[PDB]
C-alpha cells in the first residue's frame, strides 16, 4: 500500500495472508467471507508466465494478524486449505479478466475480536455504492513504493475513490473489461494512494450507510507501477462474479 497509514487493531478483521508453505513466503492478501471460505485473486494461485501453479497442498493462510514481525499469541490463527477453486474463465494471458479464486479452509476458524467475515455485496449494495467518486478502502502488507524499508510491519490501509470507466479506459492501453473497475485519485485531486505489489488478492471494501456493514466490492488485481499520476489501480469486480462465488460455496460448502 502506497501513501497509506497503519491500520488500527481489529480494523480489518477479515484480512487474510496467503503463504507458500515451502519455502515459507508471503504471497498475497485475501479475505475471510465465512468461517471456512477465503476469497483471493486467481493470479495468486495460477500464473503460468511466472511458473506459478499452486494447489491446496502448497499453501496456508494466517488470519487475524496486525503485525507481521511478531507472532500474535491468542490472536492469530493458521489454517491449511482443503481445496482451491479458480474461476474457469480467468484470463491470465492478457488482461487478468475474472481474476478471482476461492479457498476452503481445512477446518473452520472461530470468530473473535480479531477474526470476522466481510459481507459480499447484494444487488442493492452494488447498485447503490459502486459509483464514481464514492470511496472504498484497500488493505495489505505489500510494497510501500513502486521502487531501507519496502515492506511494512503493520497492516496498511488507504481510502480511494472509484473512478469513472472512461477515465479508467483512457488511462491504460490494456483492454479492460466490465469484470474490473479502477480506483484512485486523479492528478488534479491533490491526494494520493494506491495498492502495490504484494497487496494483490486483498480486499477493496466499502461501508454501507444503509446497515453499517462492510462489503467487499473489489479484489486487488493489477496496475502499471504504483501511485503514478494518471494511473489507477484495477480491482476484480466482486459483485459481477457473485453467481460463480455462490455456485462454488453452495456446491462445495461441504
Amino acid at each position: 500500500i502506497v501513501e497509506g497509514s497503519d491500520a488500527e487493531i481489529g480494523m480489518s478483521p477479515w484480512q487474510v495472508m496467503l503463504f507458500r508453505k515451502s519455502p515459507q513466503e508471503l504471497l498475497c492478501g485475501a479475505s475471510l467471507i465465512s468461517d471456512r471460505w477465503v476469497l483471493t485473486a486467481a493470479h495468486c494461485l495460477l500464473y503460468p508466465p511466472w511458473d506459478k501453479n499452486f494447489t491446496e497442498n502448497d499453501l496456508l493462510v494466517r488470519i487475524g494478524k496486525h503485525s507481521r514481525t511478531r507472532y500474535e499469541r491468542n490472536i492469530e490463527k493458521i489454517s491449511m486449505l482443503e481445496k482451491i477453486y479458480i474461476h474457469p474463465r480467468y484470463n491470465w494471458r492478457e488482461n487478468l479478466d475474472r481474476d478471482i479464486a476461492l479457498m476452503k479452509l481445512k477446518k473452520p476458524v472461530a470468530f473473535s475480536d480479531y477474526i470476522h467475515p466481510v459481507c459480499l455485496p447484494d444487488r442493492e449494495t452494488a447498485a447503490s455504492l459502486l459509483q464514481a467518486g464514492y470511496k472504498g478502502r484497500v488493505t495489505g502488507w505489500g510494497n510501500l513504493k513502486e521502487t531501507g524499508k519496502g515492506q511494512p510491519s503493520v497492516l496498511q490501509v488507504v481510502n480511494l475513490p472509484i473512478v469513472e470507466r472512461p477515465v479508467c479506459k483512457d488511462s491504460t492501453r490494456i483492454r479492460i473489461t466490465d469484470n474490473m473497475f479502477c480506483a484512485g485519485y486523479k492528478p488534479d485531486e491533490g491526494k494520493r494512494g494506491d495498492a502495490c505489489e504484494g497487496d494483490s488478492g486483498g480486499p477493496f471494501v466499502m461501508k454501507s450507510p444503509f446497515n453499517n456493514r462492510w462489503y467487499q466490492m473489489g479484489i486487488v488485481s493489477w496496475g502499471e507501477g504504483c501511485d503514478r499520476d494518471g494511473k489507477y489501480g484495477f480491482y476484480t469486480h466482486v459483485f459481477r462474479l457473485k453467481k460463480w462465488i455462490q455456485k462454488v460455496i453452495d456446491q462445495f460448502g461441504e
Partner: peptide
C-alpha cells in the same frame, strides 16, 4: 448475517479513524 460488523468498532459503537471519509464521499463524491 453477522458479516461486516467489526467486534472492536461497529459492535462497540466505536468508529475507526477514517471511516467518516468514506461516508462523506456518498455526499460529496
Amino acid at each position: 448475517a453477522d458479516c461486516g460488523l467489526r467486534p472492536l468498532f461497529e459492535k462497540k459503537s466505536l468508529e475507526d479513524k477514517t471511516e467518516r471519509e468514506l461516508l462523506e464521499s456518498y455526499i460529496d463524491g
